[PDB]
Amino acid sequence: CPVSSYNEWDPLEEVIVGRAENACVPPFTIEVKANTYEKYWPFYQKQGGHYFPKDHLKKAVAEIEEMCNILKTEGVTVRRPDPIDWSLKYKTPDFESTGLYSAMPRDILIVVGNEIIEAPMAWRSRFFEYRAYRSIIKDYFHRGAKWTTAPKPTMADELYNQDYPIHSVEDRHKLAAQGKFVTTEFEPCFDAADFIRAGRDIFAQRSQVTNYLGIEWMRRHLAPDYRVHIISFKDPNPMHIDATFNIIGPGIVLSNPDRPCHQIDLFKKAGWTIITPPTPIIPDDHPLWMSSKWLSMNVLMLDEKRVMVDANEVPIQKMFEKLGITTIKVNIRNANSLGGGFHAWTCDVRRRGTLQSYLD
């Protein structure tokens, strides 16, 4: 079976890497506004529905081709989504929208064992994102993998908190503490990236795009073999867990200094090593439209002792080096603008290893 991955560190053999092509600025709706930094609001207000800066996309394409070259050298089979125009306007009975991109496979696909799971998504601009990956998924299906598509939400207004403290309010930390974000509990919804795998245990975070209904759906779908746990952090704008609590080895995790975990004791007690990375060195003047600066810790492990880290982040490189971890430096400064690091731009289809417990 081509599909087989139980965690984030076993020897990588096959991966899907996203595309920067035809990426489009999402329409500036409630859920998009909730994610965007004040700094970029004008960009969104004017660019919404049109392609992200073509000059920038050309550089991102270049950067990702090089990253694929390197993965190939490291002995990894690379698959890529199909090219699609994300500017096509679609209309369901509940809403109308233009698309985003197929840059982040991690956002939409998660592999648990020999099964590929397509997350429902929570953003209107990402409703039909799965279309880019069907050619790859049908092939794995023909070859034996299990294929599951979690329930696709209606994404009706009812799913969003029309009156969320968007604009700037920060007490959104208070709602955050109450497990309350821009998505309601109207229907299940989640991005695959809010889940991070550690064998028989999977950790999930209730974020702006992943609700309790979505988490419960996964937990209930993977039981009894896998245990899905919920963990939270200090963060007024959570979306995906891989730039907050990135698990890089059996009992080793990278915890974002700015986003501490309320349940860190579960891990200290289990005898896990909690490493806090150094601060990103990316200039404040570089466009990070969909994200924070912490993409530096969004690393991808080729195996336990090999990490693909950003060429520009020397401090985090040094940290891995003192730990005895071989750093493979790839530069993706421009691809970073679309919202992800290596963990986000990929989806590990097959790693060599077995289903085990590490919290045990």
Add this chain to the structure above:
Amino acid sequence: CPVSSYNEWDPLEEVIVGRAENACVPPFTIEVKANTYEKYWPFYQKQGGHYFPKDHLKKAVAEIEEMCNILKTEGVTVRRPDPIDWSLKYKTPDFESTGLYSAMPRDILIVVGNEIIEAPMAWRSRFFEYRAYRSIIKDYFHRGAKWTTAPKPTMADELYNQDYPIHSVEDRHKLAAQGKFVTTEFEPCFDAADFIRAGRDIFAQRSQVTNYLGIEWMRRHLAPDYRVHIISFKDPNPMHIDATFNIIGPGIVLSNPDRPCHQIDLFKKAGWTIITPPTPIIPDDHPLWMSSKWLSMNVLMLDEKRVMVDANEVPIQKMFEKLGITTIKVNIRNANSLGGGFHAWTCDVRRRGTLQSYLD
């Protein structure tokens, strides 16, 4: 758990019954043309996209309200889809269309144990049909049921045989013999009604709307607990199996005289009773837009000795009576026009019983 049904005959306790409201004539595309009798082509060519005759829909609504009254008297909890306007035009990146109806729950939902499964569908006009049932499904989910949505196809041209012997060709029997219909094997697709449950064994038929990919998806999704078997019949236009091979009891099945099963020996050898019903008596002048006359055998079992049969079909009533089966006569002559009998207008959510084997 509200959801619990392993076969078609155990004591019925809860059911979803469809709605005739706002039903719309589907656009006359390849897959629709393949299903429609020459007789109704003008009706489709002119009515496509508009509501089915309002005068007729009013009678169907009346008939179904009475059927719900009766189910209530028989001690069955009745749930109904939410009212929706099926005339709304939607547009995915692959196609554009108007809707059909939420009259046939059997077409889209199937319950295996404590799990509700939403079929992907194969008709463009039925892409968003699931929207009518989400309120009911979320409630069962909150109450403990498992909820699965099979992969939703793109329904791109590639899924359909643009040059299928539609118009009238009959050698479509030859393709039929080759397992070839109007849907290709491009991506998985199926209507839930092509599957019929008998405990640990489920029988499926490759039809115009259910391909081998769709069958394989189910088989692979329900293994190891349930065995999905494929069976075929003499039929140049298969769609749903419940008016062809309707299983009404442990080891008892109604086989359509005109649609014999190529694998009938599996059943004779298992010691099953194969009953062939009498011919329908519905007048040839009554509009049967979406179906054949055989809706008469599309019965619904309240339990092993109680069947809900059409008030007008005396001959089939007599047959059940000689068998010691109590007939509950409900008239749905007009609802028949939308395409189904009792088995089609409903979906059994809960029946009292256990998972057993009957082929054993």
